[PDB]
Design a protein around this ligand. Structure first.
Ligand code: BCL
Ligand code: BCL
Ligand code: BCL
Ligand code: BCL
Ligand code: BCL
Ligand code: BCL
Ligand code: BCL
Ligand code: BCL
Ligand code: BCL
Lengths: 357, 357, 357
């Protein structure tokens, strides 16, 4: 029988939206990857840089093995809000695949805009979900052309841009490789044609550098969390100490195994009336994973454990928890099991938890 | 276990395409709504107004409660065919959400056009399904700007239209909220950019009125019933007395419960050769519901009852009925059960019923 | 219970990428066709014409019965590669539906272009799958206007082209009938507006002929095999004798039954290191069938038999085979059964088989 075994745990901090999240999962069904096996490890870290100007330093490392090819991507960036709609970033990183690698540095800004703002909606809807909007990226990137492969790609690109009028359109076929293209529509997401503002070869300290300045916008009909939850997804103001997440998966023709461990702020939020809630589930991950969650029938063997800070209690949970031991609450079987099956297949049915002192 | 229990009943009138439809359904699986609970009641009524000019008066009321917010929409309209391709309407209604509400009045015409008409298809295909075409809307609407929220929205819009060249394009991200966007492609449906022909503030008897005149077209590759079955979906010529439908659902994290009761013309149609059929199932509802029907495994406990007028008998049914008692025919289990599972998940496999005297 | 019973067999030739493929399948679940019943037979044949210029002659016959309407399409074409990116074709055929039929002749070229070519990818990825690109069609077609239906359609079209500026856009709604439209996005595929280069009525030996010259391009994000595997899908260089495939299905409200039998080159390919593999599974068929494979729950009763040439053995298989008798290997149950369920529902998880002497 195909069985998914999972275990999730959330330990909340008092007052502080911080939480520790742990997850383990294993399913004996094949992944929908046309190249197997595929293993990946991810490590994310962020630390307060300069709280006066709202800067944080984020670092990410992705490492994987796909059909015997070793890949790696690292990125380090400094990010800050300038206004409520405009955020800026500056960073550098590296990509490496087998014997090949290249570096890059960049600076960019993103402006997030909602299509409407209405007090009539605001005062009448206590927990608004869909927020339609558009987000603008303005990027400057630099890559040292220090090997023949880079030179070839740079020259090929400069040739294409200057010869093909549809380049700004067709580039999207290249960018959203494989089923990434398909996922755009699934999430109510649109990518505009790009605008190329400048392409130059500079003379760097150590050699020629390919410099490019370009922009694009991305629209969302309300499920794109990047747009609808712009402020909430970057809780820089609550980052009083370093946060981190380590996650990884191993997969082949027999099954998938995953592990996650992290601690960061933003896990709980003020729900008003003196109540707090675990944050609303982001929609994108459920909709995108929904594209791969329907290929094998499975049974669910799942459990969730929520540990509240001392003296806090759950005022409302639906689905309902099965047991409680002081501050620890557990869910398993029954309606919780049906909800897990549901979300693993792509459903976004609400699972709400409100707690208070 | 997840079980869907449903009961459907159709009682046909003799000769007259009229029928009474009753449906009850309950499933213990969560709905895919990111806000729960969600309850809704709908009431539709239509009555012959002036049969000489083909006018009917339709009225609709929608009432719901979503996460504790009460919403309501009413609409009343007079509709008539002018030609076989052009239909006109004039009406008014109201929207209300919590402490907020606004009214509106409108007049509009819709022109439905098929991309081709061929006698070679017509004489060779007895029961044609896909009909590709395009439909044009021309709308004039008026809303009294009688509160600050309306004024804010009106001024914001007039500002956007005059400052953003992409407004006619991006408005579509706002219009098709959440997963409504996604459903467009799923049904082979396209919405053009809008055309804004006029935006004015008039001086009404009781205050300023925001007046707008705009158009859009919508294409369909053949599954869009609004286009392919343009004439059949508005049987004004068979409406010799008032028709109505009452329907509603209650839903939360535990399950969904639905009830429908109606009586209206258009349930049966001439199939030629002296035969009649229950109308072909519209495709849109199956394809759209198919987007939410695949998140939980279920067992089917379903029954269908068809009551023919006295002296009529079923000449062909596939799937086959299980039993017959005079004019009453029943379906349950076996192939019918597999067909129900199929359509609830998004399939459009044909279920045909032909009857005759 | 819904059960799918299938049997697949591959017999490989030694050295030669030739293989014989046999498949039988039956499932008692209804097809997603809004018109039933639907039966179809297909016959394909190809033979070396002139190996010096790389020409092959291909012939196809499609015959079906849909809801009692008999349809038939035949096509015969001569095809050759001119370069590695450009292929040319010349042919003729016929379409017939009930009492109607028409012929056609044509000549066209297709140019396939990849968006990038990189040695860094080539040397580091041993078995590349996604290849983004665009394909250009240039078509000249001729149809004798020998009946009133043809004349009507021709005149209607010439009228539309000259009156509607959006014809080159809207024609796509007509072309991708029903759910064919939807399938485009699902496979990461895009069709451009068409370009009409010429529309003329010529005076043929036997009467007026409608002549048209038009083009279109089609983009693919990497799953479109027509683009990413352009060379491999037309193994003209391995066609040393005639190849053929016969296939057909019967279907109605009770189930689907299918049979396939063929022999052709391209079934196995050099995998490097002295190893050979069965070719990578094309992605389109799995993704498109995935749109209809999820409407009924089923159990799998499936078996695969692979017969290698004398003296060859399997060096790697995942999922693993169950048994081996000399050169014959069999798969059934366990991980193979889960893989079948997976691909029948739309998954593309890799099933790899490497063999060698
Ligand atoms: C049988 C039903 C099964 C099931 C079947 C499958 C199948 C089948 C698959 C998965 C896959 C996965 N499943 Mg599942 N899965 C089940 C239940 C679970 C459970 C659980 C029970 O709790 C968990 C935790 C998981 C977890 C996972 C992940 C390990 C994995 C998806 C990886 C991912 O996020 O990539 C997200 C990837 C991306 C975002 C990459 C995008 C790249 C493109 C080009 C886009 C660029 C983005 C943008 C430009 C970059 C942003 C720029 C800004 C700077 C940010 N599944 C159920 C029970 N699962 C998939 C997988 O990969 O397995 C190895 C997969 O194929
Ligand atoms: C450039 C990227 C953006 C950004 C984009 C997003 C987006 C987009 C989302 C979040 C979400 C969240 N972010 Mg943010 N976020 C950024 C910086 C931060 C910082 C910080 C101070 O720098 C913090 C503390 C957080 C914290 C948070 C939480 C409030 C929330 C996740 C809650 C949860 O329970 O997850 C539980 C944690 C897990 C289940 C494990 C996740 C572990 C894996 C390793 C990470 C995901 C990998 C992703 C699928 C693959 C990346 C592919 C790209 C090609 C690289 N973000 C930067 C500025 N963030 C999510 C949310 O809910 O928003 C409201 C969300 O949708
Ligand atoms: C959507 C968003 C959102 C939302 C944001 C950006 C921002 C950025 N985007 Mg965008 C799509 C694109 C593409 C593309 C070609 O598809 C590009 C090139 C960019 C480029 C960029 C940069 C200009 C900028 C900084 C990214 C960064 O630092 O990555 C760092 C890379 C990572 C951290 C890798 C993983 C990120 C994932 C999505 C985070 C998941 C959070 C997880 C659930 C919880 C995290 C807890 C941790 C302890 C932090 N985006 N894009 C951000 C910005 O600063 O604007 C100026 C921003 O806020
Ligand atoms: C486990 C599998 C389950 C299942 C799982 C689900 C799930 C999961 C969900 C449903 C949902 C629903 N299911 Mg189901 N369901 C099952 C079987 C059934 C059976 C049955 C057995 O007979 C029935 C009768 C139902 C009935 C229903 C409905 C009560 C409900 C869809 C509401 C709707 O139509 O909104 C249609 C809504 C719209 C058309 C709104 C569109 C708004 C957008 C912005 C578009 C504008 C349109 C346009 C501009 C206006 C027109 C202008 C012209 C003037 C006309 N289901 C199977 C057995 N069902 C959904 C729901 O809402 O539940 C509460 C849902 O999430
Ligand atoms: C402005 C809207 C259009 C219109 C648009 C449509 C569309 C679109 C369709 C129909 C369909 C039908 N219409 Mg019509 N229809 C109109 C006016 C009428 C009038 C009349 C004289 O005024 C009559 C008698 C009918 C009668 C009929 C039937 C012939 C047929 C439904 C058969 C059935 O078995 O349903 C069985 C009944 C049910 C299963 C219960 C339905 C109950 C719920 C309350 C109604 C649906 C709500 C919808 C999902 C949500 C609306 C969301 C919008 C945002 C408001 N229509 C007006 C002019 N009609 C359908 C059909 O089959 O076409 C051939 C269809 O697809
Ligand atoms: C598709 C169609 C179709 C099809 C039609 C329209 C028509 C109209 N459309 Mg359109 C999309 C849009 C949008 C939008 C912004 O998305 C707008 C603003 C409009 C606007 C309008 C009006 C100009 C006009 C009258 C609507 C009306 O009276 O509603 C009244 C609202 C309701 C009745 C609510 C529920 C309607 C549902 C879809 C009916 C389901 C029928 C049910 C299955 C069986 C009914 C039996 C009853 C006893 C009647 N459409 N659109 C119609 C017209 O008159 O053209 C001039 C028309 O025929
Ligand atoms: C319950 C789950 C079931 C299941 C449920 C279904 C359902 C439901 C359906 C099918 C359908 C089919 N299934 Mg299945 N199926 C199952 C398992 C199987 C197994 C097996 C176990 O091995 C097999 C062999 C099959 C085989 C098949 C086929 C007989 C059939 C798809 C026909 C096709 O290819 O049309 C491909 C068709 C096209 C490509 C036509 C495209 C026309 C459009 C307009 C596009 C034009 C293309 C282009 C312009 C022309 C090219 C130009 C160049 C010159 C080339 N299924 C699983 C177990 N199957 C479907 C069917 O048709 O059944 C009769 C269907 O509805
Ligand atoms: C105009 C069409 C193109 C073409 C387009 C494609 C496409 C597209 C694909 C192939 C694929 C393959 N082609 Mg090629 N192919 C052409 C000419 C040929 C010639 C030849 C010398 O003329 C040969 C020998 C082949 C041989 C091959 C194999 C290498 C490979 C199938 C392997 C397999 O196991 O299938 C197993 C066989 C079966 C499972 C049975 C199939 C039987 C049915 C009758 C055929 C499919 C019908 C299709 C679904 C419906 C057609 C609808 C259209 C509207 C007409 N092609 C011409 C030039 N070929 C596939 C592949 O894997 O590419 C790498 C693939 O995706
Ligand atoms: C994608 C491709 C690909 C890929 C190719 C074409 C080629 C052609 N395309 Mg295109 C889409 C379109 C549409 C459209 C309106 O949608 C049109 C009109 C065309 C028109 C054409 C012609 C100019 C040309 C020759 C087709 C032919 O001979 O058919 C013959 C028809 C058939 C053989 C019917 C079935 C074809 C299926 C897809 C083959 C499946 C193979 C099966 C899996 C294994 C086969 C083994 C056998 C023993 C052969 N394409 N298109 C080809 C060409 O020659 O370019 C110059 C080419 O290589």
């Amino acid at each position: 029988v195909t069985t998914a075994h999972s275990d999730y745990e959330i330990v909340l901090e008092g007052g502080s939206s911080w939480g520790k999240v742990k997850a383990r999962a294993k399913v004996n069904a094949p992944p929908a990857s046309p190249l197997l096996p595929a293993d990946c490890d991810v490590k994310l870290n962020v630390k307060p840089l300069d709280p006066a100007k709202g800067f944080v330093r984020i670092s990410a490392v992705f490492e994987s093995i796909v059909d015997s090819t070793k890949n790696k991507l690292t990125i380090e960036a400094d990010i800050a809000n300038e206004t409520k709609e405009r955020r800026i970033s500056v960073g550098e990183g590296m990509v490496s695949v087998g014997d090949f690698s290249h570096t890059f540095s960049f600076e960019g800004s993103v402006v997030n805009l909602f299509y409407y703002r209405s007090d009539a909606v605001r005062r009448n809807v206590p927990n608004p979900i869909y927020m339609q909007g558009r987000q603008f990226h303005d990027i400057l990137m630099k890559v040292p052309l220090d090997n023949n492969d880079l030179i070839d790609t740079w020259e090929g690109t400069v040739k294409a841009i200057g010869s093909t009028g549809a380049f700004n359109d067709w580039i999207r076929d290249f960018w959203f490789i494989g089923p990434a293209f398909t996922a755009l529509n699934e999430g109510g997401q649109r990518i505009s044609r790009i605008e190329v503002n400048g392409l130059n070869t500079e003379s760097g300290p150590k050699g020629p550098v390919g410099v490019s300045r370009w922009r694009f916008s991305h629209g969302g009909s309300g499920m794109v969390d990047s747009i609808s939850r712009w402020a909430e997804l970057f809780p820089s103001d609550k980052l009083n100490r370093p946060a981190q997440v380590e996650a990884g998966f191993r997969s082949d023709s027999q099954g998938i195994e995953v592990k996650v461990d992290g601690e960061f702020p933003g896990v709980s939020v003020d729900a008003g009336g003196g109540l707090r809630r675990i944050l609303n589930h982001p929609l994108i991950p459920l909709v995108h994973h929904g594209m791969v969650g329907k290929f094998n029938n499975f049974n669910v063997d799942a459990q969730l454990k929520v540990v509240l800070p001392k003296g806090y209690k759950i005022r409302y949970a639906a689905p309902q928890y099965r047991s409680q031991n002081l501050e620890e609450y557990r869910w398993s079987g029954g309606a919780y099991a049906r909800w897990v099956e549901h979300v693993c297949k792509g459903g976004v049915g609400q699972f709400e938890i409100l707690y208070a002192q």
